[PDB]
Design an enzyme around this catalytic site. Structure first.
Site, PDB file in Angstrom:
ATOM      1  N   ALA A 107       0.832  -1.192   0.000  1.00  0.00           N
ATOM      2  CA  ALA A 107       0.000   0.000   0.000  1.00  0.00           C
ATOM      3  C   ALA A 107       0.871   1.248   0.000  1.00  0.00           C
ATOM      4  O   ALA A 107       1.734   1.417   0.867  1.00  0.00           O
ATOM      5  CB  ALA A 107      -0.926   0.001   1.214  1.00  0.00           C
ATOM      6  N   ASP A 108       0.644   2.122  -0.975  1.00  0.00           N
ATOM      7  CA  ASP A 108       1.405   3.348  -1.125  1.00  0.00           C
ATOM      8  C   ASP A 108       0.677   4.496  -0.419  1.00  0.00           C
ATOM      9  O   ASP A 108      -0.284   4.276   0.326  1.00  0.00           O
ATOM     10  CB  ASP A 108       1.644   3.622  -2.617  1.00  0.00           C
ATOM     11  CG  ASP A 108       0.360   3.688  -3.415  1.00  0.00           C
ATOM     12  OD1 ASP A 108      -0.727   3.620  -2.802  1.00  0.00           O
ATOM     13  OD2 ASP A 108       0.433   3.811  -4.654  1.00  0.00           O
ATOM     14  N   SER A 109       1.131   5.724  -0.656  1.00  0.00           N
ATOM     15  CA  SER A 109       0.643   6.909   0.035  1.00  0.00           C
ATOM     16  C   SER A 109      -0.880   6.966   0.111  1.00  0.00           C
ATOM     17  O   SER A 109      -1.458   6.891   1.204  1.00  0.00           O
ATOM     18  CB  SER A 109       1.187   8.147  -0.680  1.00  0.00           C
ATOM     19  OG  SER A 109       0.721   9.350  -0.101  1.00  0.00           O
ATOM     20  N   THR A 125      -2.497   3.877   1.785  1.00  0.00           N
ATOM     21  CA  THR A 125      -2.427   3.915   3.242  1.00  0.00           C
ATOM     22  C   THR A 125      -3.379   4.961   3.815  1.00  0.00           C
ATOM     23  O   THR A 125      -3.964   4.754   4.887  1.00  0.00           O
ATOM     24  CB  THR A 125      -0.996   4.189   3.701  1.00  0.00           C
ATOM     25  OG1 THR A 125      -0.562   5.464   3.205  1.00  0.00           O
ATOM     26  CG2 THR A 125      -0.054   3.089   3.224  1.00  0.00           C
TER      27      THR A 125
END
Lengths: 50, 79, 50, 72
Positions: free
Chosen positions: D33-35, D38
């Site tokens: 999960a990226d920016s 998340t």
């Protein structure tokens, strides 16, 4: 030889370009709606906390 | 007008069937022979009237097919 | 003035709740497409940032 | 329960397998999960238990174990 290959190429290219145009557009539409609502939510969050 | 080839058949298809190469080719094709680039006469002929031949043979419930490598052949349907 | 401002704050709070629910619901659906586009179809071809 | 409601939220907000999401499974490197992913994960965690979290204390959360630790 030419007459063969040229044909083949034309069909390849046309299908590729039209299919990507057809799909990517709506995929980006969805991504953009999600981005927009997230941005609105973050602005509301920050303003509420402050 | 009446008594005019277009009433019954496209001109290009009739032109193809009237060619001197057709009987040979037809005979062969029906027998299962594949046609490549080396037999120029035949290959060229095929190329020139591809769609007419396809449409023609369709009457028989058989597909006139063109592989990516440039060779023609016949594929029969279940019917 | 602070009591009056706490009323604007509460309006913003209700708005923020609504937006929060909508965003989460969007993500839930979009997840399936993400698992489905793991075929290397997304990296450049589908995600045309232009 | 809370310790499995956290998995319910994480798997369905990141799309990763239930087996993948262990207690120590970090979101960014393990779950990927990226920016924005998340961000949506923390928003969903807030919604599930109808609570709110501070910005800094929330961003400090970067793992399933940390997620539950702040949740429980």
């Amino acid at each position: 030889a030419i007459r063969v290959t040229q044909s083949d190429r034309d069909l390849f290219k046309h299908l590729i370009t039209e299919a990507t145009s057809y799909v990517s557009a709506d995929y980006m539409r969805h991504a953009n709606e999600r981005r927009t609502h997230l941005d609105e939510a973050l602005a509301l969050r920050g303003e509420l906390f402050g | 007008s009446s008594t005019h080839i277009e009433q019954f058949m496209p001109v290009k298809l009739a032109q193809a069937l009237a060619n001197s190469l057709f009987p040979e080719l037809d005979s062969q094709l029906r027998a299962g022979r594949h046609i490549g680039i080396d037999d120029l006469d035949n290959h060229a002929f095929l190329m020139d009237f591809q769609e007419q031949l396809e449409e023609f043979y369709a009457r028989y419930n058989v597909e006139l097919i063109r592989a990516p490598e440039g060779f023609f052949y016949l594929r029969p349907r279940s019917t | 003035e602070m009591e009056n401002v706490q009323k604007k704050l509460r309006k913003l709070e209700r708005d923020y709740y609504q937006i929060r629910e909508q965003v989460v619901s969007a993500k839930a659906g979009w997840c399936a497409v993400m698992r489905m586009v793991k075929d290397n179809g997304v990296e450049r071809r589908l995600h045309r940032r232009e | 329960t809370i310790e499995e409601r956290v998995k319910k939220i994480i798997g369905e907000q990141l799309g990763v397998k239930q087996e993948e999401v262990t207690n120590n499974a970090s979101f960014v490197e393990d779950l990927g999960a990226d920016s924005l992913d998340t961000v949506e994960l923390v928003m969903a965690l807030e919604e599930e238990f109808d609570t709110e979290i501070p910005d800094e204390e929330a961003e400090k959360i970067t793992t399933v174990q940390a997620a539950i630790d702040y949740i429980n």
